[PDB]
Amino acid sequence: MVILGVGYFLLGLILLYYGSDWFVLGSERIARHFNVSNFVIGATVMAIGTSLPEILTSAYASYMHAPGISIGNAIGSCICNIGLVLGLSAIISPIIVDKNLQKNILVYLLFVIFAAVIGIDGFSWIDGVVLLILFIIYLRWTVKNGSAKNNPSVVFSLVLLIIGLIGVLVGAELFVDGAKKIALALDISDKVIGFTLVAFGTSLPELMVSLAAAKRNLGGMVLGNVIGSNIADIGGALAVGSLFMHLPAENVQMAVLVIMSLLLYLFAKYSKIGRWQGILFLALYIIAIASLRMGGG
Ligand SMILES: CCCCCCCC/C=C\CCCCCCCC(=O)OC[C@H](O)CO
Ligand SMILES: CCCCCCCCCCCCCCC
Ligand SMILES: CCCCCCCCCCCCCCC
Ligand SMILES: CCCCCCCCCCCCCCC
Ligand SMILES: [Cl-]
Ligand SMILES: [Cl-]
Ligand code: NA
Ligand code: NA
Ligand code: NA
Ligand code: NA
């Protein structure tokens, strides 16, 4: 019970570690095959793939009459993606954002602000429909502005990507499941702590994938994965959750996300996303997890 919890924990870490690199390699190759930028492949394929945990979690939680957990997971992931994921990544591999990608980030900021405004009185299923539709439009807009029998180079690329994705998604589950089995076996299980860590567990793909891309100096891919995941977490995870049940307002967390998203845009536009910007993101994330209400909603 405690040993197989350790077994799942270690195997999950191994799958997350190597799986992320394969997912990054396959995605980088796919981008070159389709003549799209690393940002675009990160903001679409990689972002949605790594956000599959959030979507399922939010859908399931809301369906089970826990809409607090549903939006808690969605928004908490967004704060984690900028604060922790991008924070660590920018320090590892500083990013100077090109003028084209700056417009994408601006559209991201508008989306976030829009979601924050309509969410002041919580999120209804109609709010969900609109956000999902904007999500779809964002994806098509992003691909268009980043664009332009079967080859063994292409095949091997798709194998890498898919197996890499399977690795990080399964790896994240073994890690979470393993940790829960340990805590249960040691009788230190805490539901409030567990639900507080929900967003982090589903964020393990983004974290490991972005660090792997950061190590290979793929800053466009990193930035794409962060921006795209947040949009997927709002226009997808949050949205689907609201389809099952009205989600309660999280005005403080939305306010935190808006500030972080604004900072991200300002750095991208007028500066860079490097060491000291990354330090600030991490510091704000640390302050966030130190002061925000626990229970994950
Ligand atoms: C042009 C979109 C680009 C990508 C997003 C950038 C940020 C957009 C945020 C607000 C503007 C749009 C408000 C209208 C959104 C689309 C239509 C819609 O959702 O129609 C459903 C109807 O509003 C149910 O009452
Ligand atoms: C025309 C080029 C872009 C195609 C983009 C297809 C995007 C499909 C996105 C599906 C998202 C489903 C989210 C469910 C929560
Ligand atoms: C970033 C704006 C989020 C929505 C703010 C709406 C007006 C205030 C509503 C009461 C908010 C209490 C928490 C304030 C941070
Ligand atoms: C390549 C590494 C360069 C030096 C990186 C220093 C990182 C400092 C991170 C500080 C995070 C916030 C701490 C708040 C107390
Ligand atoms: Cl709840
Ligand atoms: Cl790149
Ligand atoms: Na994601
Ligand atoms: Na609303
Ligand atoms: Na998450
Ligand atoms: Na995720």
Side-chain angles (χ1 to χ4, degrees), residues 8-21:
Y8 284 1
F9 188 93
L10 297 183
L11 187 64
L13 280 176
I14 299 177
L15 292 181
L16 271 171
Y17 188 83
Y18 291 99
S20 59
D21 204 41

PDB file of all heavy atoms in Angstrom, residues 8-21:
ATOM      1  N   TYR A   8       4.335   4.016  -7.680  1.00  0.00           N
ATOM      2  CA  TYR A   8       3.603   4.904  -8.579  1.00  0.00           C
ATOM      3  C   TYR A   8       4.241   6.287  -8.620  1.00  0.00           C
ATOM      4  O   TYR A   8       4.315   6.919  -9.673  1.00  0.00           O
ATOM      5  CB  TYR A   8       2.140   5.027  -8.144  1.00  0.00           C
ATOM      6  CG  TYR A   8       1.270   3.837  -8.478  1.00  0.00           C
ATOM      7  CD1 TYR A   8       1.792   2.718  -9.113  1.00  0.00           C
ATOM      8  CD2 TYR A   8      -0.083   3.842  -8.169  1.00  0.00           C
ATOM      9  CE1 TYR A   8       0.989   1.633  -9.421  1.00  0.00           C
ATOM     10  CE2 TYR A   8      -0.891   2.766  -8.473  1.00  0.00           C
ATOM     11  CZ  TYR A   8      -0.351   1.664  -9.099  1.00  0.00           C
ATOM     12  OH  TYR A   8      -1.156   0.592  -9.403  1.00  0.00           O
ATOM     13  N   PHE A   9       4.691   6.748  -7.457  1.00  0.00           N
ATOM     14  CA  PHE A   9       5.297   8.065  -7.317  1.00  0.00           C
ATOM     15  C   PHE A   9       6.570   8.190  -8.150  1.00  0.00           C
ATOM     16  O   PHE A   9       6.775   9.188  -8.841  1.00  0.00           O
ATOM     17  CB  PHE A   9       5.597   8.344  -5.844  1.00  0.00           C
ATOM     18  CG  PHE A   9       6.056   9.745  -5.568  1.00  0.00           C
ATOM     19  CD1 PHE A   9       5.144  10.727  -5.220  1.00  0.00           C
ATOM     20  CD2 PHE A   9       7.398  10.080  -5.641  1.00  0.00           C
ATOM     21  CE1 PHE A   9       5.561  12.018  -4.958  1.00  0.00           C
ATOM     22  CE2 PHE A   9       7.824  11.370  -5.381  1.00  0.00           C
ATOM     23  CZ  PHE A   9       6.903  12.339  -5.038  1.00  0.00           C
ATOM     24  N   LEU A  10       7.423   7.173  -8.080  1.00  0.00           N
ATOM     25  CA  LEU A  10       8.701   7.203  -8.781  1.00  0.00           C
ATOM     26  C   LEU A  10       8.520   6.998 -10.283  1.00  0.00           C
ATOM     27  O   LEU A  10       9.116   7.712 -11.089  1.00  0.00           O
ATOM     28  CB  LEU A  10       9.649   6.145  -8.213  1.00  0.00           C
ATOM     29  CG  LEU A  10      10.037   6.330  -6.744  1.00  0.00           C
ATOM     30  CD1 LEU A  10      11.036   5.269  -6.308  1.00  0.00           C
ATOM     31  CD2 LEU A  10      10.591   7.728  -6.504  1.00  0.00           C
ATOM     32  N   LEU A  11       7.695   6.020 -10.651  1.00  0.00           N
ATOM     33  CA  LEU A  11       7.412   5.744 -12.055  1.00  0.00           C
ATOM     34  C   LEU A  11       6.751   6.941 -12.734  1.00  0.00           C
ATOM     35  O   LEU A  11       7.043   7.247 -13.889  1.00  0.00           O
ATOM     36  CB  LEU A  11       6.523   4.505 -12.195  1.00  0.00           C
ATOM     37  CG  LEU A  11       6.300   4.034 -13.634  1.00  0.00           C
ATOM     38  CD1 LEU A  11       7.611   3.582 -14.258  1.00  0.00           C
ATOM     39  CD2 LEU A  11       5.257   2.928 -13.700  1.00  0.00           C
ATOM     40  N   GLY A  12       5.858   7.610 -12.009  1.00  0.00           N
ATOM     41  CA  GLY A  12       5.207   8.806 -12.512  1.00  0.00           C
ATOM     42  C   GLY A  12       6.205   9.906 -12.820  1.00  0.00           C
ATOM     43  O   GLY A  12       6.089  10.597 -13.831  1.00  0.00           O
ATOM     44  N   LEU A  13       7.193  10.063 -11.944  1.00  0.00           N
ATOM     45  CA  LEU A  13       8.252  11.046 -12.141  1.00  0.00           C
ATOM     46  C   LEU A  13       9.112  10.710 -13.353  1.00  0.00           C
ATOM     47  O   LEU A  13       9.525  11.601 -14.094  1.00  0.00           O
ATOM     48  CB  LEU A  13       9.126  11.149 -10.893  1.00  0.00           C
ATOM     49  CG  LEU A  13       8.560  12.000  -9.760  1.00  0.00           C
ATOM     50  CD1 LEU A  13       9.469  11.951  -8.540  1.00  0.00           C
ATOM     51  CD2 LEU A  13       8.377  13.431 -10.238  1.00  0.00           C
ATOM     52  N   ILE A  14       9.382   9.422 -13.543  1.00  0.00           N
ATOM     53  CA  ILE A  14      10.183   8.964 -14.671  1.00  0.00           C
ATOM     54  C   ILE A  14       9.462   9.221 -15.990  1.00  0.00           C
ATOM     55  O   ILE A  14      10.062   9.700 -16.954  1.00  0.00           O
ATOM     56  CB  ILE A  14      10.514   7.461 -14.553  1.00  0.00           C
ATOM     57  CG1 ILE A  14      11.333   7.196 -13.289  1.00  0.00           C
ATOM     58  CG2 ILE A  14      11.267   6.979 -15.786  1.00  0.00           C
ATOM     59  CD1 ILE A  14      11.641   5.733 -13.052  1.00  0.00           C
ATOM     60  N   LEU A  15       8.172   8.901 -16.023  1.00  0.00           N
ATOM     61  CA  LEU A  15       7.359   9.119 -17.213  1.00  0.00           C
ATOM     62  C   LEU A  15       7.202  10.605 -17.515  1.00  0.00           C
ATOM     63  O   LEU A  15       7.240  11.015 -18.672  1.00  0.00           O
ATOM     64  CB  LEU A  15       5.984   8.469 -17.054  1.00  0.00           C
ATOM     65  CG  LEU A  15       5.955   6.942 -17.028  1.00  0.00           C
ATOM     66  CD1 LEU A  15       4.525   6.432 -16.901  1.00  0.00           C
ATOM     67  CD2 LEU A  15       6.619   6.381 -18.273  1.00  0.00           C
ATOM     68  N   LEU A  16       7.026  11.412 -16.473  1.00  0.00           N
ATOM     69  CA  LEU A  16       6.919  12.855 -16.649  1.00  0.00           C
ATOM     70  C   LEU A  16       8.213  13.451 -17.190  1.00  0.00           C
ATOM     71  O   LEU A  16       8.187  14.348 -18.031  1.00  0.00           O
ATOM     72  CB  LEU A  16       6.545  13.535 -15.332  1.00  0.00           C
ATOM     73  CG  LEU A  16       5.052  13.677 -15.050  1.00  0.00           C
ATOM     74  CD1 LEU A  16       4.824  14.166 -13.631  1.00  0.00           C
ATOM     75  CD2 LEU A  16       4.409  14.623 -16.058  1.00  0.00           C
ATOM     76  N   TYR A  17       9.342  12.944 -16.706  1.00  0.00           N
ATOM     77  CA  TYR A  17      10.642  13.484 -17.085  1.00  0.00           C
ATOM     78  C   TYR A  17      10.979  13.211 -18.550  1.00  0.00           C
ATOM     79  O   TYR A  17      11.244  14.137 -19.316  1.00  0.00           O
ATOM     80  CB  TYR A  17      11.741  12.914 -16.184  1.00  0.00           C
ATOM     81  CG  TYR A  17      13.091  13.563 -16.393  1.00  0.00           C
ATOM     82  CD1 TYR A  17      13.406  14.761 -15.768  1.00  0.00           C
ATOM     83  CD2 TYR A  17      14.049  12.978 -17.210  1.00  0.00           C
ATOM     84  CE1 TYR A  17      14.635  15.361 -15.953  1.00  0.00           C
ATOM     85  CE2 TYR A  17      15.284  13.573 -17.402  1.00  0.00           C
ATOM     86  CZ  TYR A  17      15.569  14.764 -16.770  1.00  0.00           C
ATOM     87  OH  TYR A  17      16.795  15.364 -16.952  1.00  0.00           O
ATOM     88  N   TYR A  18      10.973  11.941 -18.938  1.00  0.00           N
ATOM     89  CA  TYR A  18      11.323  11.568 -20.306  1.00  0.00           C
ATOM     90  C   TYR A  18      10.182  11.850 -21.272  1.00  0.00           C
ATOM     91  O   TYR A  18      10.413  12.218 -22.421  1.00  0.00           O
ATOM     92  CB  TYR A  18      11.721  10.093 -20.377  1.00  0.00           C
ATOM     93  CG  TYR A  18      13.028   9.796 -19.680  1.00  0.00           C
ATOM     94  CD1 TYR A  18      13.050   9.278 -18.390  1.00  0.00           C
ATOM     95  CD2 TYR A  18      14.240  10.044 -20.308  1.00  0.00           C
ATOM     96  CE1 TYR A  18      14.245   9.011 -17.749  1.00  0.00           C
ATOM     97  CE2 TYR A  18      15.438   9.781 -19.676  1.00  0.00           C
ATOM     98  CZ  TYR A  18      15.436   9.264 -18.397  1.00  0.00           C
ATOM     99  OH  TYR A  18      16.629   9.001 -17.766  1.00  0.00           O
ATOM    100  N   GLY A  19       8.952  11.680 -20.797  1.00  0.00           N
ATOM    101  CA  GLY A  19       7.779  11.938 -21.607  1.00  0.00           C
ATOM    102  C   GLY A  19       7.682  13.378 -22.074  1.00  0.00           C
ATOM    103  O   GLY A  19       7.280  13.637 -23.208  1.00  0.00           O
ATOM    104  N   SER A  20       8.051  14.318 -21.209  1.00  0.00           N
ATOM    105  CA  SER A  20       7.966  15.732 -21.561  1.00  0.00           C
ATOM    106  C   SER A  20       8.923  16.063 -22.703  1.00  0.00           C
ATOM    107  O   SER A  20       8.555  16.772 -23.640  1.00  0.00           O
ATOM    108  CB  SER A  20       8.254  16.618 -20.344  1.00  0.00           C
ATOM    109  OG  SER A  20       9.540  16.368 -19.810  1.00  0.00           O
ATOM    110  N   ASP A  21      10.138  15.527 -22.628  1.00  0.00           N
ATOM    111  CA  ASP A  21      11.158  15.778 -23.639  1.00  0.00           C
ATOM    112  C   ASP A  21      10.740  15.243 -25.008  1.00  0.00           C
ATOM    113  O   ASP A  21      10.914  15.919 -26.021  1.00  0.00           O
ATOM    114  CB  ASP A  21      12.493  15.158 -23.221  1.00  0.00           C
ATOM    115  CG  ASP A  21      13.684  15.829 -23.887  1.00  0.00           C
ATOM    116  OD1 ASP A  21      13.684  17.074 -24.007  1.00  0.00           O
ATOM    117  OD2 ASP A  21      14.622  15.112 -24.292  1.00  0.00           O
TER     118      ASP A  21
END
